[PDB]
Amino acid sequence: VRRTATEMQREHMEIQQAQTQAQLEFLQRKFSNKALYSWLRGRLASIY
Amino acid sequence: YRFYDLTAARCMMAEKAYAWQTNDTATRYIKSGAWQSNNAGLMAGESLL
Amino acid sequence: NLSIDGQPLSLPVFAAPADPAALLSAAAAASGGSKPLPSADIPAMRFPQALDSARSLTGQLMQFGSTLLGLIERRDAEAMSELLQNQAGELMLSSLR
Amino acid sequence: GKTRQKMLSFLSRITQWLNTQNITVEQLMLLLDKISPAAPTKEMQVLLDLLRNGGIDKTNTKTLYTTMAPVITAAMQLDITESGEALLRWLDNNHPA
Amino acid sequence: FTETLLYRKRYGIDTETALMLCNAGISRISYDGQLSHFDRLFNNPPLNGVTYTLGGDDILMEPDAGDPRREVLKRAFRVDNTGLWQLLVITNRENKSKTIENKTEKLRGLLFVRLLADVHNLTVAQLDALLQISPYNSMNVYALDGKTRQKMLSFLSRITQWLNTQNITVEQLMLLLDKISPAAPTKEMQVLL
Amino acid sequence: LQTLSQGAPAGTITELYNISDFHNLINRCGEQAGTVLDALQSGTLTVKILAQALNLSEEVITQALTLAGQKPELTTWAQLAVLPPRLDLADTLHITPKDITTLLTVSENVRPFYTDLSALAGLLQAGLNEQQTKQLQNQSEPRRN
Amino acid sequence: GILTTSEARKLIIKKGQTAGDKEKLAAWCQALAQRVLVIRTFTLSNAELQTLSQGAPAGTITELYNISDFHNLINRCGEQAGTVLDALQSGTLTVK
C-alpha cells in the first residue's frame, strides 16, 4: 500500500512537471512576452 | 489599427503642406516602418510623432 | 543453476531505468511586415496648422497605444491567473486521491 | 608518442574545462563554428527595416554604436543598450575575415 | 492462431477472450471440467432461476419494451438498457431491425462487439462514436471476414494508443471530427456579428 | 440568475427545492451551461443539445422526462429541475429512468403479478457487479433451501 | 458548404440578414470554433499554426494523425523551431 501511494506521489510530481511546462509555454506564447518588451524598449530608446 | 490609418494620412498631409510651404520636395520626413506587425502596431504614435 | 530449494544461485538481471526526458516545446519569434504609408495630398491648411492637426491625432494614437498595451498585458495576466487555478484544481484532485 | 600524449592532454584539459564552465560540446561548437553564410531571416528583415528607416545612423564614430545599439540589443535581447554599444565595438575590433 | 497469440500479447487477455476476439463462437459445451462460456455468461447464476435457453423468435432490443431475456443479455454483456441497443446498432449499421434472433451467432456478434470496447478500455458509447470516424461505418460482424476484422482491431488499437499519447479523450476527438449540421446562431454570436 | 428572473417562485421550501434542483442540473451542464441557458431563454432547448451538454444520451433524458411527462417541449426551467432527482435515482440503481417507472408501479402495487415482480427482479439484478451478484446468490441460496 | 471568408464578409455586411444565410454564418463560426479546438488540443504554437495555414487538411483521423506527427517533429526542434518553420515557409529548408 505504501508503494502504491509513492507511485501516486510520483504521478503527482509528474503532473506538476507537466504544469510547470504549461506555464513556461504560456509565458513564451503570450503576447506581452520578453521579446515584445525588448523590441519596444529598443525602438523607444532609439526614438528617445 | 484603423486609427493608425488616419494618423499616417494626417502626417502625410502635414508633410505635403510642408513641401508646399517650403519648396523642398526632395526631402521627406514622415517615413514608413511606424507600424510593425511584430508589435501589433504598438508605438506607432511614437515613431510618427 | 538453482539451489536445492529452487532459489536462484545467480544474481538477478538488473536494468538501469531510463532518466525521465527533459520536456522541450517550440518557441518562435513573431514575424510581420510593416505597413506602407498612405497616398499624400496637399491639405487645406498651411503647414504650421496641418502639423498641429496631425500632432493632436498622434497624441491620441499614443493614448490608444498605451491603453492597448495595458489591456494586452492585463488580459495575459488574467489568463495566467486562471491557468494557475485550473492547475491547482487538477492538483488537489491528486492530493485528495 | 609525442603528439598522441599531447592530444590526450588537450582532450582531458578541454573536457575538464567544459565540465567546470558547465557548457557542453554542442555549445562549444556553436561558439567555435564558422559562418558559411546563407539567406537572411524574417526577423532579420525586421531588424534591417528598423535600421533602414528611422534616424540615419551618424557617420562619425562613437555615435554609430550608440545609434545602432538599442535596436541591435532589442534583436539580441541583451541586458543593457550599453552592453549593446560595447558588443558592436568588440565584434568590430576582432572578427572572422 | 497467430492472431489469437497477438491479441493475447497486446491487451493482455485470456486465451478465451483472444479467441472470442478472433471471431469464435460461444461454446455451449463445458470445457476442462469447468463452466461453459455460454453458462458462465448467461446462467451464472441463472437470472431468477430461469435458465436462459436459445428459445428463438423472441428478443427485443429497443429499450421501451419488456422481455425477460433482454435482462440476461444486459447482465452478460455488462451493458445497460441503452447500451444493449447500441451494441445492436454497432453490430450492423445497415440493418435497422429492432429485434434479434436468439441463435448463437447473434449473441457471438454482440459479445464480440462488447469485447471490442472492453479490450481497448472503451465504453460502448465510445466504441460507437469511434467507429463512425473510422472506415468501418458500414460493417457487418456476421460478414466480417478475417482481413477486415484484424484491420479494424488494428485501427482501434492504433487510435486508442494515439489518444492515450496525445492525452485527448474520445469526446474531444468526436468534437474535433463532428460535422456542423447548423442551427440558430447564439447571443454571443449576435454580439460578434 | 437571468433564467430564474422571468418568474421563478421563491419563498417557500417547496420552491427552494426546485431552485436547488435547477441549480444542480446547471452545475452538471458545467462549461456548457451557457448554451443550455441560452437555448432555454429562446425557444430552442432540445434534448440533443441538453444531452450533449450533460454528457449523457438522448435515450436517457427523453426517458427521464416521461416521468411526470413533458417530453417534447422543453420550454421552462421548471422542466429541468425535474431531471436531477430522476437522474440521481437511475444512477444509484444502475438502470435507465424508463426502468424506474417499473420499480415504482410494482413496488407500490399491493398484489403485484409474479411476472411483473420477476421482470423487476431481473432488471435490478442485471445492473449488479459480478461479486455483487455472487454475494446476492450466497444470500439467496440458503433462504430457498 | 461552409463560407469562404470573403463570403462571410459579404454575408455579414448585408441589408437585412434573412432567416436563411444566418445559420450559414453560424455554421461558419462553428467551423471556426472546431478549428480553434484542433489548435487547442494539440497546443500548436503560432508558427506551427502559420505553417499549417497554407493547406493542412484536417477533419478526418488520417489527417489529424499527420498534424500530430508534424507537431511532434516541431516540438523536437524546440528552441530552433522558428528557423525550421521559417526556412519551410520559404523554399530553403535543407537537411543541414
Distance CA E109, CA E141 (A): 6
G60 interfaces chain D, CB cutoff of 8 Å: no
Range F96-133 burial, b when 16+ CB lie within 10 A, else e? bbbbbebbeebeeeeeeeeeeebbbebbbbbbeeeeeb
Please check whether residue E68 is in contact with residue F125, taking contact to mean a CB–CB distance below 8 angstroms. no
Distance CA E124, CA E117 (A): 6
Residue C53 phi, psi dihedral angles, 5° rounding: -65, -40
Name, in order, each residue with C-beta under 8 angstroms of F30's C-beta and a sequence gap of 6 or more: F53
Helix (H, G, I), strand (E, B) or coil at D2: helix
Please check whether residue F123 is in contact with residue E71, taking contact to mean a CB–CB distance below 8 angstroms. yes
Integer-rounded Cα Rg, in Å, for chain E is 19
Counting every residue written for chain F, the total comes to: 145
Please check whether residue B34 is in contact with residue C56, taking contact to mean a CB–CB distance below 8 angstroms. no
Distance CA C18, CA D90 (A): 44
Please check whether residue F10 is in contact with residue F40, taking contact to mean a CB–CB distance below 8 angstroms. no
Selection from E136, E95, E119, E148 nearest residue E20 by Cα: E119
The residue in chain A having the minimum alpha-carbon distance to the alpha carbon of residue G79 is A28
Please check whether residue E52 is in contact with residue E69, taking contact to mean a CB–CB distance below 8 angstroms. yes
Q: Specify the residue for cell string 557617420.
A: D59
Residues paired with residue E99 on neighbouring β-strands, in sequence order: E60
Residue E46 has what DSSP assignment?
Answer: B
Asked if D38 and G83 come within 8 Å (Cβ–Cβ), the reply is: no
Resolution, Å (one decimal) = 3.2
G83 interfaces chain D, CB cutoff of 8 Å: yes
Residue B1 has what DSSP assignment?
Answer: -
Selection from D45, C39, C23, F16 nearest residue B33 by Cα: D45
Q: Which of G17, G22, G41 sits opposite E176 (nearest CB)?
A: G41
Counting every residue written for chain C, the total comes to: 97
Min distance C34 CA to chain A CA atoms (Å): 14
Q: Specify the residue for cell string 423472441.
A: E58
Distance CA E158, CA E155 (A): 5
Please check whether residue E125 is in contact with residue E117, taking contact to mean a CB–CB distance below 8 angstroms. no
Separation in Å, CA E40 to CA B9, B11, E43, F51: 85, 88, 6, 35
Chain E, window 35-74: residues with a beta carbon less than 8 angstroms from a chain F beta carbon = 45, 47-48, 50, 63-64, 66, 68, 71-72, 74
Distance CA E1, CA E146 (A): 12
The single-letter code of the amino acid at E185 is P
Q: Which of B9, B10, B18 sits opposite C47 (nearest CB)?
A: B18
Helix (H, G, I), strand (E, B) or coil at A10: helix
Please check whether residue D86 is in contact with residue D67, taking contact to mean a CB–CB distance below 8 angstroms. no
Separation in Å, CA F130 to CA A46, D57, F123, G74: 77, 83, 15, 48
Query: What angle (nearest 5°) sits at the alpha carbon of residue G62, between those of residues G59 and G65?
Result: 95
Q: Which residues of G touch C32 (CB under 8 A)?
A: none
- Enclosing H/E stretch for F54: helix F47-54
Q: Which residues of C touch G82 (CB under 8 A)?
A: 26-29
The neighbour count for residue D60, using CB atoms within 10 Å, is: 6
Residue C9 phi, psi dihedral angles, 5° rounding: -85, -10
- CB-hemisphere CA count at 13 Å for E124? 23
> Peptide bond preceding E45: is omega within 30 degrees of 0, i.e. cis?
yes
Instruction: Describe the crossing of helices C47-96 and B4-21 by its angle, rounded to 10 degrees.
Output: 160
Asked if C31 and D49 come within 8 Å (Cβ–Cβ), the reply is: no
Distance CA F63, CA F83 (A): 10
Helix (H, G, I), strand (E, B) or coil at A48: coil
D46 interfaces chain C, CB cutoff of 8 Å: yes
Integer-rounded Cα Rg, in Å, for chain F is 19
Min distance E62 CA to chain F CA atoms (Å): 10
Distance CA F83, CA D54 (A): 68
Residue C2 phi, psi dihedral angles, 5° rounding: -90, 175
Question: How was it solved?
Answer: cryo-EM
Please check whether residue C73 is in contact with residue A8, taking contact to mean a CB–CB distance below 8 angstroms. no
Residue D92 phi, psi dihedral angles, 5° rounding: -65, -45
Name, in order, each residue with C-beta under 8 angstroms of A2's C-beta and a sequence gap of 6 or more: none
Helix (H, G, I), strand (E, B) or coil at F33: helix
Neighbours of chain D (3+ CB pairs under 8 A): A, B, C, G
What HEC string does chain C produce? CECCCCCECCCCCCCCCCCCCCCCCCCCCCCCCECCCCCCCCCCCCHHHHHHHHHHHHHHHHHHHHHHHHHHHHHHHHHHHHHHHHHHHHHHHHHHC
**Is chain G adjacent to chain C, meaning 3+ CB pairs within 8 angstroms?**
yes
Residues paired with residue E60 on neighbouring β-strands, in sequence order: E99
Selection from F91, F96, F83 nearest residue F23 by Cα: F83
Distance CA G74, CA D82 (A): 36
Residue F67 has what DSSP assignment?
Answer: T
- Using CA of residue A40, residue A43, residue A44, residue B2, what is the dihedral sign? negative
- Using CA of residue F102, residue F108, residue F113, residue F117, what is the dihedral sign? positive
Please check whether residue F127 is in contact with residue F94, taking contact to mean a CB–CB distance below 8 angstroms. yes
- CB-hemisphere CA count at 13 Å for F123? 24
Asked if A43 and B38 come within 8 Å (Cβ–Cβ), the reply is: no
Q: How far is CA F20 from the centre of its chain?
A: 15
Chain E, window 119-148: residues with a beta carbon less than 8 angstroms from a chain G beta carbon = 133-134
Please check whether residue E69 is in contact with residue E59, taking contact to mean a CB–CB distance below 8 angstroms. yes
What is the secondary structure of G30-86 as a DSSP string? HHHHHHHHHHHHHT--HHHHHHHTTT---SSHHHHHHHHHHHHHHHHHGGGHHHHHH
Which ranges in chain D belong to alpha helices (H)?
2-20, 25-32, 42-52, 64-76, 81-93
Chain D, window 34-93: residues with a beta carbon less than 8 angstroms from a chain B beta carbon = 46, 49-50, 52-54
Distance CA E182, CA C61 (A): 41
Asked if A39 and B47 come within 8 Å (Cβ–Cβ), the reply is: no
Size of interface A-B (CB pairs under 8 A): 20
Selection from E118, E154, E163 nearest residue E136 by Cα: E154
G62 interfaces chain E, CB cutoff of 8 Å: no
Please check whether residue G47 is in contact with residue G82, taking contact to mean a CB–CB distance below 8 angstroms. yes
Distance CA D80, CA D74 (A): 9
- Using CA of residue E18, residue E23, residue E26, residue E27, what is the dihedral sign? negative
What is the secondary structure of G8-34 as a DSSP string? HHHHHS-SS--STTTHHHHHHHHHHHH
Range E78-89 burial, b when 16+ CB lie within 10 A, else e? ebbbbbbbbbbb
Helix (H, G, I), strand (E, B) or coil at B36: strand
What HEC string does chain E produce? CHHHHHHHHCCCCCHHHHHHHCCCCCCCCCCCCCCCHHHHHHECCEHHHCCCCCCCCCCECCCCCCCHHHHHHHHHCCCCHHHHHHHHHHHECCCCCCECCCCHHHHHHHHHHHHHHHHCCCCHHHHHHHHHCCCCCCCEHHHCCHHHHHHHHHHHHHHHHHHHHCCCCHHHHHHHHCCCCCCCCCHHHHHHC
Q: Which residues of G touch A29 (CB under 8 A)?
A: 45-46
Name, in order, each residue with C-beta under 8 angstroms of C79's C-beta and a sequence gap of 6 or more: A26, A30
G90 interfaces chain D, CB cutoff of 8 Å: yes
Name, in order, each residue with C-beta under 8 angstroms of E150's C-beta and a sequence gap of 6 or more: E3
Residues in chain A followed by a break, C to N above 2.5 angstroms: none
Query: First and final CA of chain E: distance in angstroms?
Result: 62
The residue in chain A having the minimum alpha-carbon distance to the alpha carbon of residue C76 is A30
Query: First and final CA of chain A: distance in angstroms?
Result: 66
Selection from D66, E72, E109 nearest residue F128 by Cα: E72
Distance CA B16, CA B34 (A): 18
Q: Which residues of A touch B40 (CB under 8 A)?
A: 31
